[PDB]
Design a protein around this ligand. Structure first.
Ligand SMILES: *[C@@H]1O[C@H](CO)[C@@H](O)[C@H](O)[C@H]1NC(C)=O
Ligand SMILES: *[C@@H]1O[C@H](CO)[C@@H](O)[C@H](O)[C@H]1NC(C)=O
Length: 310
């Protein structure tokens, strides 16, 4: 269908994003370089890319009826509203005395809730998707049916509204509940470094901490300073000799005696300088190797500190 995504960092934020979004919850759906939002997509896309329908979260709006008298039915309904997905239910009007005109209406609703009505009236008249239910001349014990469709545009909290026929003292009490949370089978307590707990196959990091395994603690800005894991915009990461950790290069450790890989982009080491008399920079008695330049001790000169002032 259509699932518009990016911002999406939880299964709930995914389901909030739009009715066509679903969420893959198995943790080996993703690799290190992928953003969390790749778990949020239409059902075909995630199926196509190897997520098991067993593992695809997709809560749906639904209606739940309860006969709890004579004229309007039912009198209690409970709707779970996934944002952007209508929940529909039917109300039946029936009178033993003859009815003149049936106006189905609701009381004041918030901005976030919308109600429309189909009216299936007696003797071949149907109205569709109107703001109020409307039928003319209902007869003795002859039912008419209104289909009520309720849509939320965001996650609401528990609340109720009433549907009434004007001039009649029965009501339909509509309890409305959010359908935004995912149902995820999750461990309690490695994988988030004690700085988050797991939810639907991703880490949910404590206040102050970020990263997919909650490995970084937040700084004022950053980790959009990962461009500063590349020496320039079209270079590899940390000169191919380190890894970007929290937007900073952590350089590879080394086998070699006296060698250290260092620098903002791991571009330097302590052994690749000009040699003389067998040792780098002429040995420790003459100079020290720093990122390809020999820093000679006082008394020695030359690019490899060969010349004790010659
Ligand atoms: C991911 O791991 C589960 C076991 O928890 C396994 O059933 C599944 O096949 C794995 N995914 C792939 C793509 O192999
Ligand atoms: C309500 O009744 C109509 C027939 O009058 C039917 O087409 C529709 O599917 C019903 N709605 C529900 C939610 O059962």
């Amino acid at each position: 269908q259509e699932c518009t995504k990016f911002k999406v960092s939880s299964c709930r934020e995914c389901i909030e994003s739009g009715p066509g979004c679903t969420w893959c919850q198995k943790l080996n759906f993703t690799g290190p370089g992928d953003p969390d939002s790749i778990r949020c997509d239409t059902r075909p896309q995630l199926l196509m890319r190897g997520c098991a329908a067993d593992d695809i979260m997709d809560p749906t709006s639904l209606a739940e009826t309860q006969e709890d008298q004579k004229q309007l039915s039912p009198q209690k309904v409970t709707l779970y509203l996934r944002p952007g997905q209508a929940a529909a239910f039917n109300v039946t009007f029936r009178r033993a005395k003859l009815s003149s005109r049936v106006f189905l209406d609701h009381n004041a609703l918030p901005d976030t809730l919308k109600v429309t009505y189909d009216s299936f009236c007696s003797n071949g008249v149907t109205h569709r998707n109107q703001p109020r239910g409307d039928c003319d001349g209902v007869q003795i014990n002859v039912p008419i049916t209104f289909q009520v469709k309720v849509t939320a545009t965001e996650c609401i909290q528990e609340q109720s509204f009433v549907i009434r026929a004007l001039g009649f003292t029965d009501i339909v009490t509509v309890q409305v509940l959010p359908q935004c949370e995912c149902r995820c089978r999750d461990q309690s307590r490695s994988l988030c470094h004690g700085k988050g707990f797991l939810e639907c196959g991703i880490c949910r990091c404590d206040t102050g901490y970020i990263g997919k395994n909650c490995e970084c603690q937040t700084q004022g800005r950053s980790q959009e300073l990962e461009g500063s894991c590349r020496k320039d915009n079209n270079s590899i990461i940390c000169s191919g000799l380190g890894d970007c950790v929290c937007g900073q290069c952590l350089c590879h450790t080394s086998d070699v005696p006296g060698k250290l890989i260092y620098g903002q982009y791991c571009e330097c080491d302590t052994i690749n300088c000009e040699r003389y008399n067998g040792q780098v920079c002429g040995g420790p008695g003459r100079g020290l190797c720093f990122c390809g330049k020999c820093r000679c001790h006082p008394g020695f000169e030359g690019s490899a500190c060969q010349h004790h002032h010659h």
